[PDB]
Amino acid sequence: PGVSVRDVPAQDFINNYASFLQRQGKLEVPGYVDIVKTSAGNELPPQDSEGWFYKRAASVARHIYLRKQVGVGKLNKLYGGAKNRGVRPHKHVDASGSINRKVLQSLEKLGVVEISPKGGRRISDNGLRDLDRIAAATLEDEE
Amino acid sequence: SLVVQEQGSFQHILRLLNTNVDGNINVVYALTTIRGVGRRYANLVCKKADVDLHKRAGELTQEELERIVQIMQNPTHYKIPAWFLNRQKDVNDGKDYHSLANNLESKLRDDLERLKKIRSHRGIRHFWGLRVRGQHTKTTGRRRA
Amino acid sequence: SKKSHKDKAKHAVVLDQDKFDRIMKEAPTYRYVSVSVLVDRFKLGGSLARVALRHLENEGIIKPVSKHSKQAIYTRAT
Amino acid sequence: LKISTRKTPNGEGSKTWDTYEMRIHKRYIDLEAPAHIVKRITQITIEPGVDVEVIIAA
Amino acid sequence: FVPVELATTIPVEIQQAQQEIKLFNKWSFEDVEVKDASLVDYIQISKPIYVAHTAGRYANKRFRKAQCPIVERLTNSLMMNGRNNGKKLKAVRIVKHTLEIINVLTDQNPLQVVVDAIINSGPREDTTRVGGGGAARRQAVDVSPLRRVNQSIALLTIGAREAAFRNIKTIAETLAEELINAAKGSSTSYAIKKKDELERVAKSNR
Amino acid sequence: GRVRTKTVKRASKALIEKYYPKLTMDFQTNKRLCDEIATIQSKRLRNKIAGYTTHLMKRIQKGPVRG
Amino acid sequence: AHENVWYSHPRKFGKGSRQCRISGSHSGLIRKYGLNIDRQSFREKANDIGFYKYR
Amino acid sequence: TVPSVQTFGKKKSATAVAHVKAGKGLIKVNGSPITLVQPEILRFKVYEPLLLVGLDKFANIDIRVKVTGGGHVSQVYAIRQAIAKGLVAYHQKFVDEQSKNELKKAFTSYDRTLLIADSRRPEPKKFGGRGARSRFQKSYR
Amino acid sequence: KTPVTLAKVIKVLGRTGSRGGVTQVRVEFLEDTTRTIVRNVKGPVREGDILVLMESEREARRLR
RNA sequence: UUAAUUGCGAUAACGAACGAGACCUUAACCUACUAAAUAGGGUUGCUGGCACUUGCCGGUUGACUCUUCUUAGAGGGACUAUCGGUUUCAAGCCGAUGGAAGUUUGAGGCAAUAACAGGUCUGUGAUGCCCUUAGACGUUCUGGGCCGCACGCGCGCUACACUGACGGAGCCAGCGAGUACAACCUUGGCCGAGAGGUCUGGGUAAUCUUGUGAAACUCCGUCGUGCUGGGGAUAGAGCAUUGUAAUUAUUGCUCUUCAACGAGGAAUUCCUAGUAAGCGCAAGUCAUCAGCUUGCGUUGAUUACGUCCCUGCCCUUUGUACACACC
Numbered sequence A: 001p002g003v004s005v006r007d008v009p010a011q012d013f014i015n016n017y018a019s020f021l022q023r024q025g026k027l028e029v030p031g032y033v034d035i036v037k038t039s040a041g042n043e044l045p046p047q048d049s050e051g052w053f054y055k056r057a058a059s060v061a062r063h064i065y066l067r068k069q070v071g072v073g074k075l076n077k078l079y080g081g082a083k084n085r086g087v088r089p090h091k092h093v094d095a096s097g098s099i100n101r102k103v104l105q106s107l108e109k110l111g112v113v114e115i116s117p118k119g120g121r122r123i124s125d126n127g128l129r130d131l132d133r134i135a136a137a138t139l140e141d142e143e
Numbered sequence B: 001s002l003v004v005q006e007q008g009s010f011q012h013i014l015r016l017l018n019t020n021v022d023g024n025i026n027v028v029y030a031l032t033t034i035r036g037v038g039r040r041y042a043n044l045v046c047k048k049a050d051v052d053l054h055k056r057a058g059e060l061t062q063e064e065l066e067r068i069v070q071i072m073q074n075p076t077h078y079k080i081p082a083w084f085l086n087r088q089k090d091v092n093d094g095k096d097y098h099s100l101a102n103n104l105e106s107k108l109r110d111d112l113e114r115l116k117k118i119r120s121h122r123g124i125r126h127f128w129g130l131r132v133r134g135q136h137t138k139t140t141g142r143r144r145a
Numbered sequence C: 001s002k003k004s005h006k007d008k009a010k011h012a013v014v015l016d017q018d019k020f021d022r023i024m025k026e027a028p029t030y031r032y033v034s035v036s037v038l039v040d041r042f043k044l045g046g047s048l049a050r051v052a053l054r055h056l057e058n059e060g061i062i063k064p065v066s067k068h069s070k071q072a073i074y075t076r077a078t
Numbered sequence D: 001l002k003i004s005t006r007k008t009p010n011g012e013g014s015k016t017w018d019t020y021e022m023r024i025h026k027r028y029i030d031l032e033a034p035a036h037i038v039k040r041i042t043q044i045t046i047e048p049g050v051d052v053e054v055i056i057a058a
Numbered sequence E: 001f002v003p004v005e006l007a008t009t010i011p012v013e014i015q016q017a018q019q020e021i022k023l024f025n026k027w028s029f030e031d032v033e034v035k036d037a038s039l040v041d042y043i044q045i046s047k048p049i050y051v052a053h054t055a056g057r058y059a060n061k062r063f064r065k066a067q068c069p070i071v072e073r074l075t076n077s078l079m080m081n082g083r084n085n086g087k088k089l090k091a092v093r094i095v096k097h098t099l100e101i102i103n104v105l106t107d108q109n110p111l112q113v114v115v116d117a118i119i120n121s122g123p124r125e126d127t128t129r130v131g132g133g134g135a136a137r138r139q140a141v142d143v144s145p146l147r148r149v150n151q152s153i154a155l156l157t158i159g160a161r162e163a164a165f166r167n168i169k170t171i172a173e174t175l176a177e178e179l180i181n182a183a184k185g186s187s188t189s190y191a192i193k194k195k196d197e198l199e200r201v202a203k204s205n206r
Numbered sequence F: 001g002r003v004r005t006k007t008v009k010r011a012s013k014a015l016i017e018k019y020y021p022k023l024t025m026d027f028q029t030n031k032r033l034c035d036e037i038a039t040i041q042s043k044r045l046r047n048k049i050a051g052y053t054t055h056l057m058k059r060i061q062k063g064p065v066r067g
Numbered sequence G: 001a002h003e004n005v006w007y008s009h010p011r012k013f014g015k016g017s018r019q020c021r022i023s024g025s026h027s028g029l030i031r032k033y034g035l036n037i038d039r040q041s042f043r044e045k046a047n048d049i050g051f052y053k054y055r
Numbered sequence H: 001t002v003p004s005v006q007t008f009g010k011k012k013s014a015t016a017v018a019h020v021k022a023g024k025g026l027i028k029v030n031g032s033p034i035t036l037v038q039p040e041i042l043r044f045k046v047y048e049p050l051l052l053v054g055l056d057k058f059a060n061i062d063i064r065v066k067v068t069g070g071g072h073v074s075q076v077y078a079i080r081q082a083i084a085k086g087l088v089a090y091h092q093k094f095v096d097e098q099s100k101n102e103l104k105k106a107f108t109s110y111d112r113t114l115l116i117a118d119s120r121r122p123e124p125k126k127f128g129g130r131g132a133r134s135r136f137q138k139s140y141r
Numbered sequence I: 001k002t003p004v005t006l007a008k009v010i011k012v013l014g015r016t017g018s019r020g021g022v023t024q025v026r027v028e029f030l031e032d033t034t035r036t037i038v039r040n041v042k043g044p045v046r047e048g049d050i051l052v053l054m055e056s057e058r059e060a061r062r063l064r
Numbered sequence J: 001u002u003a004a005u006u007g008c009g010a011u012a013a014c015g016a017a018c019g020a021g022a023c024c025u026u027a028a029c030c031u032a033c034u035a036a037a038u039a040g041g042g043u044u045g046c047u048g049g050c051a052c053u054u055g056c057c058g059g060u061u062g063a064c065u066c067u068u069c070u071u072a073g074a075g076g077g078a079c080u081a082u083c084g085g086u087u088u089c090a091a092g093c094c095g096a097u098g099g100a101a102g103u104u105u106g107a108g109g110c111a112a113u114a115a116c117a118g119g120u121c122u123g124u125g126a127u128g129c130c131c132u133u134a135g136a137c138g139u140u141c142u143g144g145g146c147c148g149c150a151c152g153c154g155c156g157c158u159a160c161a162c163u164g165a166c167g168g169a170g171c172c173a174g175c176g177a178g179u180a181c182a183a184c185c186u187u188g189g190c191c192g193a194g195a196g197g198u199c200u201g202g203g204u205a206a207u208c209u210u211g212u213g214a215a216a217c218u219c220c221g222u223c224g225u226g227c228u229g230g231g232g233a234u235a236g237a238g239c240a241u242u243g244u245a246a247u248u249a250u251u252g253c254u255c256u257u258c259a260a261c262g263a264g265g266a267a268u269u270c271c272u273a274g275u276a277a278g279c280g281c282a283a284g285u286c287a288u289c290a291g292c293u294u295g296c297g298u299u300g301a302u303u304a305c306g307u308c309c310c311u312g313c314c315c316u317u318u319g320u321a322c323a324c325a326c327c
């Protein structure tokens, strides 16, 4: 029967959506990738030098599908963990804002994310349709 | 998945910018062993040079070394930003450089002797060998060794 | 700031052909295979321990019992 | 409404603190009701301590 | 075996014959018995559990500690250092990995290996401080079976810990080695070595 | 460490000495009797008083007792 | 006491910008909910204010 | 109307509200099927009522659980207790007495918390120490 | 040899020792249940345990 | 016997008073009551998608209805209740069962007589006396210091790594607080790599920040026993924020050098269940600044359930050449 993103494991669905977005030539990566920490909390760029932006976009799209609507600051709160503040106690450091802004604009160009009246951005019918389609892809991929 | 790695060509020692570097370490962390180059800067230099990140420094070829070397002396040519550079705005001539193994320590020494000569409080504190950035010294750094 | 251990390189940072015939020869007859077990015999550095360990899942040389991260649990194929 | 305070006015003594507090209870009510009787209700039956406030919201 | 149809499809292996509760759906609590008669009723393999993780009030009364599942007690004693003190899911994962590893080496259903190692590595005679200061010695006494279980678990986990410390082998593998070696009387095991030395010392101070 | 200090013991003693025909063996009925025939300020003290009253009533039922 | 110099230093913020409202002191001040009463006078007048020891 | 009731299960600060209806064997938590509980190693904890009772007991019964508050494992235990209590309450309300009593015998003979909420809750902290019932340190010199 | 014997406690004679952490019990053998000893235990015991003894001639003496 | 000068009692003692207890706050349990667009749920609308069977996961401040969870009022509930042991058979203790709860149910708040030459005149326009009261020890302004550094000691923080570091992905709380005669909490949209900047919009508060999408934690990979990708101190350069003003680095961010540190002697500190410990968040300091404190919650144990051996405390008996009382 029909299948939503809630019926598929998070990590596998996100990996498959990243792979599918990477395979097709859409979802342009900003020219400043390979450069950025992705947050003040981190101290190195992603280990996967190329393709990590697709993973982040997949995670963002799944997050907007699951939740009500999400802006950029909320994603900054979501991503980013604890900064090793040298010899001081760790705290919570918000993620980089430019990366998430570019992710949301790229998702807008792909048509998967729509601007919501209540502020932030919500899921769009076409994009959520592709999300269910690739959730089915992963689910019948499992067995 | 795995390769025999062509016995008889894998280098074990290298001399990049007149410092001996062991080549068996990962490329970025092997480059980290030269003064003025850290894991972040070496990682970015390796990324821009298109050499494999997970490769071993003792197994990449010679023109790879010279291309990496060329990238990491004039970074601004290869789209390394104005920031992320070691010494930016360069208060001798205003051109953002990046100091290296001998150059880093040497130029730090000229900056130190400039601060000594200028008779700044920071300079005389450096000349004395005391803490500079304004930390308490009643209990901090009470042992030379 | 000590010097007590006095450890050598003690690890094949790069695999060699004779070491390849080795890893393949006792790819069986090692009734339990893991990263630490593989490097215990001085023939693997530890990063390529995972490389050769994942490579053996090619023609069913060994079987997986659990594939959780941070380690691996493999038995000889029977 | 809570405030923690050190008891010693001079810092001397074993570290001892205290917590003063009140509670505020609100209990709002809204009425789909006529005009004059509602207002007359608001201007009657007032007790010191409890504070009454009225919003028309019409 | 009779896969029940539902709108939610639980995996078949989770549905097969589940009146046969297994520890990690892999090891059977039946076929596991305590060789020693003294330490029975202080090893809790009798009850079945689907996870080595239960929020049980095993520290309210005096002797409920025995009724805690023995594997659960091993998990609780693994999570012992300041750097890793509250982490118990990690301890459960480590114990699970140890159980599969022990299954690999000498199949000998790993719960039986755990029980046998606990039986062997527990001292039977110990010492107490009795010396009156100037004439201070040790004094030979006997140990409670509950303290035998406690001490065996303690040295097993300590040996695994200092075997894993700054070492290539994982904590699960070191724990599996210690459990396997303590299943027999192999003196290479740290826990059995401490047991033997402590019993010898108690013999020397009758 | 439950010892049932002066107040509950004395109140239960007076309760028995003035209301034995109405007291019963059950805790709940005697609790209601304690509520209605005596003005105990709080309710924890009421429960303690009723409990000791029931205990003394059971002791009396077993046989005659001092005091 | 030239008006240009007397009390010329800004006092928009900091330790001495606000006082105790009881004693005029600048030490041990309680700014919570706009009390602006120092701690000792707060301990004295809490019951009158509405604050009580409860737990 | 469809025979359906609502129960709940709590942990330290977790709370799972479970609606049980006469469905088709449909068990979802937070809109996701039970097989994908937030963690992974306490998954069997949340299957535990399923396997203790037997799935065929509730094959035409659907489960919807919303779990909020508390950390991961507290939430998991909350779903555990919520599902168990929902099954028991539904069987009491609409099925039969002996069925509910048999469910309670199967449950309470195993991890009593399955039907009874845990009594332990955190101890308030006190001045003079960084912990709820610990002191800071002494100097003596 | 290995003359390991077992002994089930029938009663516990309080807790002794300068530390106050050891106890004294009256154990009766699994065999010949009319033959008993008094023995010192270092750990939590109650009526029902089965101590393991490498000796049998020993009798407990109060630790001071 | 009790945690208790708590009781059973015996009695030149009888009746009493303060303390303890009782009492309040708080944490549990309430499918029992009252109710709720400032909290949630169901049915049904109006829709989105996937399935095609009527079903699943969603959106709407459209309607009807309900209070299980969320709230807060009146109340209920536990009183060691029942039973079995043990007790001059009395106070009471131990165990099991039913319970939500059986340590005084957990945690606290008040908390007696007598006293210290204990601290505070530096909190008070509380204050006696003494001092000063004009180039002032009053008040204000500028700049410096309270942070120096051959050294010792006390709270702590980060660490010495594999139960780990680093990458991604998962995504979980409860205490709070928040702008007016001032300029607070900040969502959202654009910029910047980040700190941050800008434009708008909410919130004088269960409405908005906020479901504070917090860390530890979990899954998959890189690393591989190398003072190493641990550790991040000490410095060099640059970019911003608060501030009249930041040098003697306020603080945040970017690149680099990366030191000591190998589980730490004598000795010594805290702690028996949601406890210790790990992990962070909020509030008080606050124009900016915590490694502090007060609270809160997450993950969550080992080992007791005893003793007077060390350090002390309570009662009684005894001795004293002690009473500024074994200093």
Ligand SMILES: [Mg+2]
Pocket (backbone or CB within 6 Å): A078, A079, A080, A081
């Ligand atoms: Mg993250």
Ligand SMILES: [Mg+2]
Pocket (backbone or CB within 6 Å): none
């Ligand atoms: Mg991580």
Ligand SMILES: [Mg+2]
Pocket (backbone or CB within 6 Å): A084
């Ligand atoms: Mg760290």
Ligand SMILES: [Mg+2]
Pocket (backbone or CB within 6 Å): none
């Ligand atoms: Mg930490």
Ligand SMILES: [Mg+2]
Pocket (backbone or CB within 6 Å): H130, H131, H132
């Ligand atoms: Mg703590």
Ligand SMILES: [Mg+2]
Pocket (backbone or CB within 6 Å): none
């Ligand atoms: Mg209700």
Ligand SMILES: [Mg+2]
Pocket (backbone or CB within 6 Å): none
């Ligand atoms: Mg009785």
Ligand SMILES: [Mg+2]
Pocket (backbone or CB within 6 Å): J104
């Ligand atoms: Mg109390």
Ligand SMILES: [Mg+2]
Pocket (backbone or CB within 6 Å): J121
């Ligand atoms: Mg004066």
Ligand SMILES: [Mg+2]
Pocket (backbone or CB within 6 Å): none
């Ligand atoms: Mg003055």
Ligand SMILES: [Mg+2]
Pocket (backbone or CB within 6 Å): J146
């Ligand atoms: Mg000072």
Ligand SMILES: [Mg+2]
Pocket (backbone or CB within 6 Å): H136, J155
């Ligand atoms: Mg202190």
Ligand SMILES: [Mg+2]
Pocket (backbone or CB within 6 Å): J165, J230
């Ligand atoms: Mg590091």
Ligand SMILES: [Mg+2]
Pocket (backbone or CB within 6 Å): J173, J211
């Ligand atoms: Mg919350």
Ligand SMILES: [Mg+2]
Pocket (backbone or CB within 6 Å): A077, A078, A080, A081, J214
């Ligand atoms: Mg987070």
Ligand SMILES: [Mg+2]
Pocket (backbone or CB within 6 Å): none
């Ligand atoms: Mg290093």
